[PDB]
Design a protein around this nucleic acid. Structure first.
Ligand SMILES: [Mg+2]
Ligand SMILES: [Mg+2]
Ligand SMILES: [Mg+2]
Ligand SMILES: [Mg+2]
Ligand SMILES: [Mg+2]
Ligand SMILES: [Mg+2]
Ligand SMILES: [Mg+2]
Ligand SMILES: [Mg+2]
Ligand SMILES: [Mg+2]
Ligand SMILES: [Mg+2]
Ligand SMILES: [Mg+2]
Ligand SMILES: [Mg+2]
Ligand SMILES: [Mg+2]
Ligand SMILES: [Mg+2]
Ligand SMILES: [Mg+2]
Ligand SMILES: [Mg+2]
Ligand SMILES: [Mg+2]
Ligand SMILES: [Mg+2]
Ligand SMILES: [Mg+2]
Ligand SMILES: [Mg+2]
Ligand SMILES: [Mg+2]
Ligand SMILES: [Mg+2]
Ligand SMILES: [Mg+2]
Ligand SMILES: [Mg+2]
Ligand SMILES: [Mg+2]
Ligand SMILES: [Mg+2]
Ligand SMILES: [Mg+2]
Ligand SMILES: [Mg+2]
Ligand SMILES: [Zn+2]
Ligand SMILES: [Zn+2]
Lengths: 100, 73, 111, 53, 92
RNA sequence: ACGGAAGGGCACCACCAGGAGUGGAGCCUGCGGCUUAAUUUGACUCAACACGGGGAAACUCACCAGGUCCAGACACAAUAAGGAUUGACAGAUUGAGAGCUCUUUCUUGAUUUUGUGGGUGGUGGUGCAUGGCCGUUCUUAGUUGGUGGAGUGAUUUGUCUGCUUAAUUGCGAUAACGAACGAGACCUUAACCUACUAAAUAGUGGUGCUAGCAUUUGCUGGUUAUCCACUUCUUAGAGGGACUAUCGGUUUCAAGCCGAUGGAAGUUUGAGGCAAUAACAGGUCUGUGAUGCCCUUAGACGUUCUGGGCCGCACGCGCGCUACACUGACGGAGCCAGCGAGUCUAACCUUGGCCGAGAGGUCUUGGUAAUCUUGUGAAACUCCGUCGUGCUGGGGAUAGAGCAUUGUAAUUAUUGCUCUUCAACGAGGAAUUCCUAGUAAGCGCAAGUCAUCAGCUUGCGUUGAUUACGUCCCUGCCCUUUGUACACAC
């Protein structure tokens, strides 16, 4: 029934908690799956002069945002599908469910 | 800021205030009592025969189709 | 239909604009931060304050005002945005709150 | 009139400004956040940007 | 500032119906969202309203959040010719 | 605090031993002065001068010559529906289909206009009136209470003679005891895991289909719905691992130091982030709808339109890019990375096909991205040849002409391309900068600014040396003792 669930968070602990509860749910329902594939955590860099004005030693500041992306592939009926989208929500964690 | 010269002409020249001419809305009326019409009106179906064209000279200027009607008697 | 990078920086800018709006509006009510939990069926916004009674107002009037402002500003649909208020734990362990208290005291004229 | 705001503002430093300070100089246009560098340094920990190295 | 009565009452009836209004601080926009009137007219009408105690403002990143008071809702009732207790933005 | 006083200990923003250099030429860029209608302005030792993320056509923009608008809220008074006021075709006028203003009349109808007060705005002044941020003193190891003790007191001890350490880090000694901050611990990153979890958005092997050469099994390849199996390489998540381990020397024989072995890793493993007290009358009101005061506030210093300028050049400095050639230029072949960015109510990164010498144009395609651009087939590099010590095929400014692209607009060339012109420069004087290993240096690539414009910056990787592993001689820092007629403190 070919569903992909992608999770695109910044918080590794919340993301892994979500992944763990999803996979153990699918395992106690005994659903075939491709395990949680962890894509490269992508770093968003922004380099800025530390100062508002221009004088001083040219001190630079690199701010980073680490985006962690996981995906899981499930074979599942419509009931388990609708309840899985009902649940597996935590703050700061964004989900995308797509069929086919 | 040193000073302002205003080498421009002495030209504080702001325009009219929609010059306060006297009472208006003259079509005009006969003695007891038939009415006539000054200020020949427009040719548009949107004009409900209540808007006066102007007549400056060699041109009649509208008020409803506020500018576009121009063939002069 | 937006990339995840820009999606997340938009989430961050949304949180920041909300924080600034609330720390300008509800300063007299002990605004000690906000949380934003998006979800299927809605996004909920949990304000953490002290004077929750004054944040609510009568009949949730001010909460309705703020929900409408947020919706109109951020182009949400009516019903897709919800606001909750919560009495913050450990009022003394919140720097913004004590700073606002200092501000109001120094403005009222205390030393 | 029709000359009050005539000049196009489709590109250049006049087509953009900080969504906070309404300033044209020093824009961070990366990732579509459009914030001056100063206000970015102010609001980074709120936006989710942090220093690690 | 001078503006047409239909536009002023558009602003006022939208404000009475909703309870609030948000206006980007972008003059020369010529089209407010959710109102067919100029954003300049919106902003300055509600500014005139602010100065006489009826409505209140918060700028917050160039957006002019406006919300009305009891004086404002009573004034707008008297102005829009509506009955006593018709509807504010105060329904539970 | 200072000392051309002593003692001890440190630093390639100091030196030694050297490397690459800059200063010398051309050009780019910033600063000054000069010029100018304006050539906006801030910043002047380190701690100003490729800095204001400042690569300015317009905007940006603050400056100059001019022209509009009002966004002057609100209150009061006046005028005033026998009309407050608004707008307007055409012509004159104006750079200008700005009624801006005037001619002429039309249009609108209480929102306004005039005045008074009072506000609003200001890249206007004050950074010596402030906030916040940053930089620096200061990348060193220093700072502080409580209670006791010394002193009339300011103050001191604690916070130390020695040894040690990168380190007031420790051993310890001891009128001090017990604490705190900083340092360290911490966090991130780079290096190890053939051990865990797995994964057509990363791979590998085999088996099907298939191309070629050999044919005797084999070798090289392709192949999305051929599946099967796996996770060494790749990705991460949880964990392990190094703690100077073991051994030998050296030290009151303590802290610790040196050498060797093992190990992926033994300079606090490497590089960073965070980073104390006290201060500068450092910078910044030109980041802020952060701001007091002053000024201005409708022929406004508000705002906006047009056009110029910020590039203007007899000169002087700073950061840099090109080079002065054979360890080389050119032409062909060979041919290898990594950090990253990318389209929504839009038009981004663009493969492939065709056209064009070229730039580039066009028809399509994929990608909201570990999947597509992109193995980013980068450059230096290597191999074959041409040249031959000749300001030469080194070098490529300065100029002429043309073809394209970006953009409303390129004229004081935006940039790209083609041909031609082919200047200085023959290794750089007094001086002076950076640097101790995957570092210097060479080499290019991505991103930032960005419609276009890199010679700049932030990072990435590719090739990869010499020379110390020490000292306090110069320039400075730290602690102690000492002298001082210094205290804005040599
Ligand atoms: Mg030397
Ligand atoms: Mg050189
Ligand atoms: Mg220094
Ligand atoms: Mg300009
Ligand atoms: Mg201009
Ligand atoms: Mg101005
Ligand atoms: Mg100062
Ligand atoms: Mg200051
Ligand atoms: Mg005492
Ligand atoms: Mg005593
Ligand atoms: Mg004491
Ligand atoms: Mg095969
Ligand atoms: Mg031993
Ligand atoms: Mg370290
Ligand atoms: Mg400031
Ligand atoms: Mg300049
Ligand atoms: Mg510099
Ligand atoms: Mg040549
Ligand atoms: Mg070659
Ligand atoms: Mg690669
Ligand atoms: Mg030196
Ligand atoms: Mg670029
Ligand atoms: Mg330019
Ligand atoms: Mg620059
Ligand atoms: Mg050394
Ligand atoms: Mg003496
Ligand atoms: Mg004295
Ligand atoms: Mg002297
Ligand atoms: Zn008509
Ligand atoms: Zn800003």
């Amino acid at each position: 029934i070919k569903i992909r669930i992608t999770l695109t968070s910044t918080k590794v602990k919340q993301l892994e908690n979500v992944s763990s509860n999803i996979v153990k749910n699918a395992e106690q329902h005994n659903l075939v799956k491709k395990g949680p594939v962890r894509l490269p955590t992508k770093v968003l860099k922004i380099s800025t002069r530390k100062t508002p004005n221009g004088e001083g030693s040219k001190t630079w500041e690199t701010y980073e945002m680490r985006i962690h992306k996981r995906y899981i592939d499930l074979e599942a009926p419509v009931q388990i599908v609708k309840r899985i989208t009902q649940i597996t929500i935590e703050p700061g964690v964004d989900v995308e469910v797509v069929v086919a | 800021r040193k000073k302002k010269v205003y080498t421009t002409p002495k030209k504080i020249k702001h325009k009219h205030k929609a010059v306060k001419l006297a009472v208006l809305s003259y079509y005009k009326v006969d003695a007891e009592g038939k009415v006539t019409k000054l200020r020949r009106e427009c040719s548009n179906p949107t004009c409900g025969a209540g808007v006066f064209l102007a007549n400056h000279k060699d041109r009649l200027y509208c008020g409803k189709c506020h500018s576009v009607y121009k063939v002069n008697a | 239909l937006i990339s995840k990078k820009r999606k997340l920086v938009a989430d961050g800018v949304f949180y920041a604009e909300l924080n600034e709006f609330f720390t300008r509006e509800l300063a007299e009510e002990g605004y000690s931060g906000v949380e934003v939990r998006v979800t299927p069926t809605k996004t909920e916004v949990i304000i953490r304050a002290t004077r929750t009674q004054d944040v609510l107002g009568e009949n949730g009037r001010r909460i309705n005002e703020l929900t409408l402002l947020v919706q109109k500003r951020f182009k949400y649909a009516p019903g897709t945005i919800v606001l909750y208020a919560e009495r913050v734990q450990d009022r003394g362990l919140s720097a913004v709150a004590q700073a606002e208290s200092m501000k109001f005291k120094l403005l009222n004229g205390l030393a | 009139e029709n000359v009050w705001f005539s000049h196009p503002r489709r590109y250049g430093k006049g087509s953009r400004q900080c969504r906070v300070c309404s300033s044209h100089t020093g824009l961070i246009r990366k990732y579509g956040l459009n914030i001056c560098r100063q206000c970015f340094r102010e609001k980074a920990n709120d936006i989710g940007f942090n220093k690690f190295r | 500032m001078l503006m047409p009565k239909e536009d002023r009452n558009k602003i006022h009836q939208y404000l009475f119906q909703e309870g609030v209004v948000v206006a980007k601080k972008d003059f020369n926009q010529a089209k407010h969202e959710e109102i067919d009137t100029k954003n300049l007219y919106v902003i300055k009408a509600l500014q005139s309203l602010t100065s006489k105690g009826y409505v209140k403002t918060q700028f917050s990143w160039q957006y002019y959040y406006y919300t009305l008071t009891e004086e404002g809702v009573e004034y707008l009732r008297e102005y829009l010719n509506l009955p006593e207790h018709i509807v504010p933005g105060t329904y539970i």
